[PDB]
Amino acid sequence: SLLPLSTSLDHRSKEELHQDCLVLATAKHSSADVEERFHLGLFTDRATLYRMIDIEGKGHLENGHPELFHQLMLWKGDLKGVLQTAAERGELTDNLVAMAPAAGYHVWLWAVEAFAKQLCFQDQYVKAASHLLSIHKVYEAVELLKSNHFYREAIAIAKARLRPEDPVLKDLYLSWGTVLERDGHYAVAAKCYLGATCAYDAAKVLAKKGDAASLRTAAELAAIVGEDELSASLALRCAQELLLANNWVGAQEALQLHESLQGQRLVFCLLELLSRHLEPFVERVTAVWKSIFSLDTPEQYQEAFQKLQNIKYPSATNNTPAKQLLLHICHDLTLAVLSQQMASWDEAVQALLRAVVRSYDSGSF
Amino acid sequence: SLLPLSTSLDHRSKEELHQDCLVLATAKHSSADVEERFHLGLFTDRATLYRMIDIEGKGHLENGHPELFHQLMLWKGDLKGVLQTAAERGELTDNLVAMAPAAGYHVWLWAVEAFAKQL
């Protein structure tokens, strides 16, 4: 058990025990004979059981039980010495630090501070951070935790200690988000940026994913945080990225989140009509605009055109997939069918010529 | 690890994370929607991550890890309460008594005296 050597050399032959008793009688009544048998320190005097305990401690190596090794000094009473020598060999543990304040408060503080290091090299940074929290080392309990690549617990501790207006918590959010940027987890990065009371970059990091659903969610987030033009740009960008597989009406309703993409809405209507034509038109277009989009009056029919003539697309060279080529052609056709009525036909014929030239240029027959 | 529930309901589908981000944006800018998802307490405010930690603690029974259960209150800061309730259920341990003198000397004395009985 705790003293295997004593119980081993205490159940010997009866003659051995008789000799031990004789030696004890000789030593008690008065002494190099008692030195050979250390266990008589249990009965002889105080100066001998100390040596017996020391022998037991140095014998407590082969069984790998440093807890009893360090507890024996508590019986001897040298708590300070065993605490000091335990950290040097990397043997300080929770058991030893339990009686750390027995010798004094400063002794306990030294014990926990030293145990923090060993827990650091023993992949126990959470326990170390808790121990630094014990002496109310609030600021230090988070820097090592985040440096050890543990941001969730660090932020939890910082919020538990520090008030929300503290400057040493937003840095945790920004650092965790920046780390997550390269990891490809843009949603949680946007969450971290949102929690850092700076949502301007949250929409951008959410949009950085590139998926149409991610683009739309970034648009909605930017609308929520008050970035109206940013949300409008995000919706416009998700519009084309939604049209690839089979989605036409989904992008039609996605363009509705802000009241600045009505021209894009009626252009994507032409996209749908031209795509269906691949399975008159100039009047069916405006009829569908009147019916579905509920825009039937010359009044706004001009101001819905002036916002569509202000944007220009690239030259649309030969090397490009036909999708955005058709999108640009249909946008120009929409501009033509707009300008054909409220003004002279010069703009209509010019826009029709522009559309036909764009279609011809990119080798598209 | 220490918070299996958070890392479980934090690696969900991308649409779920987008909805969580939308709810966080709605709650930050001003709220019964944030109550359903407790992990937003990590980002929302102080009054919510306390409830998240409490939920984690009450979920720390099925895995049989009372050490983390009692360490979570150290993060929350109620060392006295966790020390007092640990002895009643027979869960006071060497780890808990390590930070016993953090709240005070008499607290440590009570902690060791109570741990003596359980031992």
Residue numbers in the entry:
A (entry chain A): 847 to 876, 884 to 1132, 1155 to 1240
B (entry chain B): 847 to 876, 884 to 972
Any passages from the paper?
Gemin5 in the Survival Motor Neuron (SMN) complex serves as the RNA-binding protein to deliver small nuclear RNAs (snRNAs) to the small nuclear ribonucleoprotein Sm complex via its N-terminal WD40 domain. Additionally, the C-terminal region plays an important role in regulating RNA translation by directly binding to viral RNAs and cellular mRNAs. Here, we present the three-dimensional structure of the Gemin5 C-terminal region, which adopts a homodecamer architecture comprised of a dimer of pentamers. By structural analysis, mutagenesis, and RNA-binding assays, we find that the intact pentamer/decamer is critical for the Gemin5 C-terminal region to bind cognate RNA ligands and to regulate mRNA translation.
To understand the mechanism underlying G5C self-assembly, we solved the structure of G5C by cryo-EM at an overall resolution of 3.31 Å based on the gold-standard Fourier shell correlation (FSC) curve. Consistent with the result from the SLS experiment, G5C forms a homodecamer with an MW of ~750 kDa. To our surprise, five G5C molecules (A–E or A’–E’) form a pentagon-like structure via its C-terminal region, named the pentamer region thereafter. Consistent with the previously solved TPR dimer structure, A–E forms homodimers with A’–E’. Thus, 10 G5C molecules assemble into a decamer comprised of a dimer of pentamers. The distance between the two parallel pentagon planes is ~177 Å with a rotation angle of 36°, and the rotation angle between the projections of two protomers in a TPR dimer, such as A and A’, is 108°. At the protomer–protomer interface of the G5C pentamer, an intermolecular five-helix bundle is formed by α28 and α29 of one protomer (molecule A, red) and α26, α31, and α32 of another protomer (molecule B, cyan), mainly via hydrophobic interactions, with a total buried accessible surface area of ~1400 Å2. In addition to hydrophobic interactions, intermolecular hydrogen bonds or salt bridges are found between Gln1378A side chain amide and Ser1472B main chain carbonyl and between Gln1389A side chain amide and Glu1462B side chain carboxyl. In the structure of the G5C decamer, two G5C dimers are spaced apart from each other, with the RBS1 of one G5C molecule (molecule C) spatially proximal to the positively charged surface of another molecule (molecule B), such that a large positively charged concave surface comprises residues from RBS1C and TPRB. Several basic residues of TPRB, including R1035, K1061, K1062, and R1090, are spatially close to RBS1C around the unstructured region between helices α26C and α27C.
